[PDB]
Design a binder for these strands. Structure first.
Lengths: 171, 109, 197, 106, 136
RNA sequence: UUUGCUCCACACAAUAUAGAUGGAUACGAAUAAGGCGUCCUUGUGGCGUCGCUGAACCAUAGCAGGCUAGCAACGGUGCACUUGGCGGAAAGGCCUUGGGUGCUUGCUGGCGAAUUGCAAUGUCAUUUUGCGUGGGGAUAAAUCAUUUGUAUACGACUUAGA
RNA sequence: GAACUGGCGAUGCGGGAUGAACCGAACGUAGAGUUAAGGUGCCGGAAUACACGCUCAUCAGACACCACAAAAGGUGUUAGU
């Protein structure tokens, strides 16, 4: 859906042999708290020997964007499962916030590789603080000095089923 | 009986003193002041039909004098208020009708 | 809203126009479509010629006379595409289809009337610039229509007469616009401008 | 004047139906001018008359009326649902019909 | 002679371009394009008209012929200051586009008595114009 | 074939309506281009302006739209004529000259309306036919039967016969 | 030819165009409202909705059961290592 980012902090259940476990923390892009906690336990079952019955979640907090009106370039490292194997990819997206960047990332992977939400693993997402570290041409195209371009062929959708003059596509 | 007393005036468009239903009118934003008219005379017993027997069948085929000078009393007090702002006599004489392209959900009355 | 709607078929897409027009007839609007030789079909001319040849193969084996009829005129091609979208085998479908007449060119009943377009079926508004399209008159004369040039000659004559009409109309409207501008900035003009007209 | 119309024109489109089963008790009306349910909400509760003619004079007239009312909106495009005292005869699919402005609330 | 081309200019999208929000919650106000996200969407701000600073798809706005000076990525105080300095609000209001919008909403706001009044005035104006249509 | 047939006008009946209820309101071409105005050396020309929908434009007041009076203009519109054109794709329509006549809400007045009783389509459209008037217009063929054989199962076809 | 369960047989209804078994849901006679599975260009009730991409096929493709296609290739095009 429209994604939100949460921090989820959890731990193992405390025993007498070891009280105070190590309080692992992860950042999850998810639609809500339930999906966020499910993905948290999914990745902790991939990492450490723990499961939901043997552990607990001590905190979940929404992390909204610090500057939601700054235009950033993000580099995203992703695992995905194809029909024959597992691959790593690095894609970079020029967008205004992290949740919108990963939303366009999920759309991009589903469009160009037919990869689903169950197949995509988000390794990391990070803002590229400096230009000329941008490595893709499709985003390096929009970083030029005095960028301007026209929008040819305007199509205006009509409300009536009949129009009384030939329309114009000037913009 | 939840009815509205209205008048034309009868000199303007020929509508007499009458009562109408509130669900069958449109309240326009045009407002005139009717202070100075003594309408407390009229009530539900003022309009009586004098119901007809079943024997009296009209095979093929009048007005109260009290009603006609009551109309003449009230309408001459209304038209003095009508003469202040222009074009109200013409507006009240003209009829209302929907033209091509009139959308009543967008029209303001 | 109108008694009869006259649609200029030039530059329109066949299927999208037919799906607009069939719903208009089923709702009860009378439609006449003129200039059927200038409809457009998306795709290559060779693709649509191959499509028509695949349609032209289909006929009843034991008697070709009772088979599917392959009509060759552009108007009858449009009629086929529209009869596909009207349930023509019922009385409601027949009553709908008798509210339609489609023509090549603009006949003399309709050359003096007003032609409209359907903006959700126009080729310049629907197709991406770069996609290839066909002309229905060219495809139809490739598959056997005999009257492509006589329609062109009649359309040239009609366009000459219509330009002669339009010059007089433009001169008259320039006179009327001049008189309206000179009769503006009076008191009735400023009151109408305050009231929105 | 030359116009005396105090109603809104509409078209009787069809019955309420699924893909293969129709229901004659609820008719579908296209009111002209309205293209959204929010504008169609103005016309709820208004009376509808289907006015037709017959050869045989019944009570002084050769013109017969079928009365009904608007009940709810239908779809996303301003079609409304209408119920009548006797249902519309289904040969009137595409026939014109009158939406009056009473019962009023303006 | 000299070489002749038809130039065919139209309404470039860049910083400082004034746009009109077509649909949405603003839906009819003016904004200034602050920066360009990608081919299909831009970051705009409309601080005088009350449009919040936001990223928006280019299909939800209409570009106007108005342009003024901004550096890219300008914050809303600078956007409002340059908007007031270039004074593009009455420059928009002087256009026939905004006059058409104002005429449309005025005709929507007319009542029945005012419609009667414009019918009477239009009859008087039609009388004098058709009287003028007899000498030329 | 006992006064029949067609057209025109209204008079009354019948007959129905795939569905009037202000107006189908006429360039062509392009869409990575145009429209309109203006100017010139008339062009793939210069300059200005417009679009961002018909949410337009025209029309629109009067007993379902009456009866009258005046002012101002010499306009606008309807009807029956009338002069001249143009239109063959399915022309059956478009334009125009002249006079008549009616209305004019461009502006200002006078009289009427009720009782359909608090709504009831509250009836005003066009399609076909018949029968009457009274006014024009014109006075045929086909088939069976007979015959032919360029035809033919029979029908049909091709011929002939005051 | 066996094991566990659910069905059809014995069962109509909405969807899968069509079908014993699939999906949804099981049934007195009616009214109103809301939905399931499935859909919303037209047939056909319902957005020619919104948003991001991809594809142009001189046999495109279009939805589980289900009404088929493989190995091997292609400076076609897109995204990656």
């Amino acid at each position: 859906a429209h994604f939100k980012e949460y921090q989820v902090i959890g731990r193992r259940l405390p025993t007498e042999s070891v009280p105070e476990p190590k309080l692992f923390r992860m950042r999850i892009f998810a639609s809500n708290e339930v999906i966020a906690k499910s993905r948290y336990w999914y990745f902790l079952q991939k990492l450490h020997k723990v499961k939901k019955a043997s552990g607990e979640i001590v905190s979940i907090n929404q992390i909204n964007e610090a500057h939601p009106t700054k235009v950033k370039n993000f580099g995203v490292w992703v695992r995905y499962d194809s029909r024959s194997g597992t691959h790593n990819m690095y894609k970079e997206i020029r967008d205004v916030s992290r949740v919108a960047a990963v939303e366009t990332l999920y759309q991009d992977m589903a469009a160009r590789h037919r990869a689903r939400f169950r197949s995509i693993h988000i390794l990391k997402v990070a803002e590229i603080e400096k230009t000329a570290d941008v490595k893709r041409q499709y985003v390096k195209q929009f970083l030029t000095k005095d960028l301007k371009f026209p929008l040819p062929h305007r199509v205006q959708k009509s409300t009536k089923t009949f129009s009384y003059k030939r329309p114009s596509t000037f913009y | 009986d939840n009815t509205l007393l209205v008048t034309g005036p009868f000199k303007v468009n020929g509508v007499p003193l009458r009562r109408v239903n509130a669900r069958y009118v449109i309240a326009t934003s045009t407002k005139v002041s009717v202070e100075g008219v003594n309408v407390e005379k009229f009530n539900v017993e003022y309009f009586a039909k004098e119901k007809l027997t079943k024997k009296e069948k009209k095979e093929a085929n009048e007005i109260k004098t009290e009603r006609v000078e009551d109309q003449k009393v009230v309408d001459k007090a209304l038209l003095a208020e009508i003469k202040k702002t222009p074009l109200l006599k013409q507006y009240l004489s003209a009829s209302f009708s929907l033209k091509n392209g009139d959308k009543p959900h967008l029209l303001k009355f | 809203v109108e008694p009869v709607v006259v649609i200029d078929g030039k530059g329109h897409l066949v299927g999208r126009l037919a799906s607009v027009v069939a719903k208009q007839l089923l709702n009860g609007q009378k439609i006449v479509v003129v200039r059927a030789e200038e409809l457009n079909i998306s795709g290559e001319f060779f693709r649509n010629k191959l499509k028509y040849h695949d349609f032209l193969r289909k006929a009843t084996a034991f008697n070709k006379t009772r088979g599917p009829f392959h009509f060759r005129a552009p108007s009858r091609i449009f009629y086929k595409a529209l009869r596909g979208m009207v349930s023509h085998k019922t009385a409601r479908g027949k009553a709908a289809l008798e509210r339609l007449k489609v023509f090549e060119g603009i006949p003399p009943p309709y050359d003096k009337k007003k032609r409209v377009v359907v903006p959700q079926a126009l080729r310049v508004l629907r197709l991406k610039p770069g996609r290839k399209y066909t002309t229905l008159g060219k495809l139809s004369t490739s598959v056997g229509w005999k009257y492509e040039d006589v329609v062109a000659k009649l359309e040239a004559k009609r366009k000459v007469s219509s330009a002669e009409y339009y010059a007089k109309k433009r001169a008259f409207t320039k006179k009327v616009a001049s008189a309206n501008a000179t009769a503006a900035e009076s008191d009735v003009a400023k009151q109408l401008a305050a009231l929105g007209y | 004047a030359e116009s005396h119309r105090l109603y809104v024109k509409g078209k009787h489109l069809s019955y309420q139906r699924s893909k293969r089963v129709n229901n004659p008790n609820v008719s579908l009306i296209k009111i002209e001018g309205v293209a959204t349910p929010q504008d169609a909400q103005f016309y709820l509760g208004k009376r509808i008359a289907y006015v037709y003619r017959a050869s045989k004079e019944v009570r002084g007239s050769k013109i017969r009326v079928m009365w009904g009312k608007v009940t709810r909106t239908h779809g996303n495009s301003g079609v409304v649902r209408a119920t009548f005292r006797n249902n519309l005869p289904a040969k009137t699919f595409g026939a014109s019909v009158r939406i009056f402005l009473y019962p009023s609330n303006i | 002679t000299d070489s002749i081309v038809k130039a065919s200019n139209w309404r470039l999208v860049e910083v400082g371009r004034v746009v009109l929000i077509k649909k949405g919650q603003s839906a009819g106000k003016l904004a200034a394009i602050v920066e360009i996200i990608d081919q299909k969407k831009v970051l705009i701000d409309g601080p005088k008209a009350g449009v919040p600073r936001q990223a928006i798809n280019l299909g939800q706005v209409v570009l106007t012929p108005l342009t003024f000076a901004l550096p890219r990525g300008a914050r809303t105080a600078t956007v409002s200051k340059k908007w007031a300095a270039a004074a593009v609000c009455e420059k928009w209001a002087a256009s026939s586009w905004a006059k058409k919008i104002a005429q449309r909403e005025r005709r929507a706001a007319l009542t029945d008595f005012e419609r009667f009044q414009v019918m009477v005035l239009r009859k008087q104006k039609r009388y004098t114009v058709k009287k003028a249509l007899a000498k030329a």
